[PDB]
């Protein structure tokens, strides 16, 4: 009852093991779960690149998630999306908001993601995906997801421009330590729930990603999220950015440290 999706293609990666990361995620999904991973995109090396190149580049993968993930949304699984980076969430969450119109989504998040074009330090994609859903800025793939149902939790060193663009757009943000189940619950109300994680949310030193934001959420604390949403609520997961080598210790290690913490809604599921 859970539908396992897996991107292999790169989506502008700076990181060099996030392909290998989700490869290994996925992985230990299939062997606890009994699941068979539908795979999609080809690798390619990570590079330091502006979003305006690695936004073209990745077209054919983020088409081919996009394609695979409304395959599963229209029916009965847990959608499950293991992703290389957040950035392919800019293919998914439109299908999320067409399909689900009044689903909340919570975006367990280290930063905001809430860049645009005009505002952007970086030129990072990945720092520009819940803006591009919610249609500040035009990724190409979509918009639609309302910003008065999209929920930041975990957020923290938020720069102010960035901070600006979120108020004005009206999306919540709950910070780390007031990120409890009481909390979450509040947020979601009475409405169908879209889960999107990246692994930078959490305190740094046990899950490998890509950035490294002190003062983060535990392992316990994603895991207590997981058992508060009720299974009949729960739309999909996606989970994104472990950073470690496919064949290394610490994939493994981080790996059960995933498993623990998304237990309680993919054992529902299972
Ligand atoms: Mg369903
Ligand atoms: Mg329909
Ligand atoms: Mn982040
Ligand atoms: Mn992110
Ligand atoms: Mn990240």
Redesign the pocket.
Known sequence: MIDLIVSQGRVADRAAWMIEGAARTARALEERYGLKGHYVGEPAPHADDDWSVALPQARETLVAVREAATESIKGDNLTVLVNNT?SVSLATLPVVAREHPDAVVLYI?????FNTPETTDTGYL??MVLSGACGLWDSGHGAGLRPEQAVLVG?RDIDEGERELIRKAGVRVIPPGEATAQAVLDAVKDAPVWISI????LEPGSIP???T?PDGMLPAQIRAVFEAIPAERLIGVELA?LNAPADSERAEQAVAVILDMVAPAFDAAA
């Not at 998040?109 to 993601?113: A, I, L, R, S």
Request: charged fraction near 35%; proline fraction near 0%; hydrophobic fraction near 20%.
């Open positions: 957040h998040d280290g930063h905001g993601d990945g720092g957020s990246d692994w930078d949310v990603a890509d950035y934001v950015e």
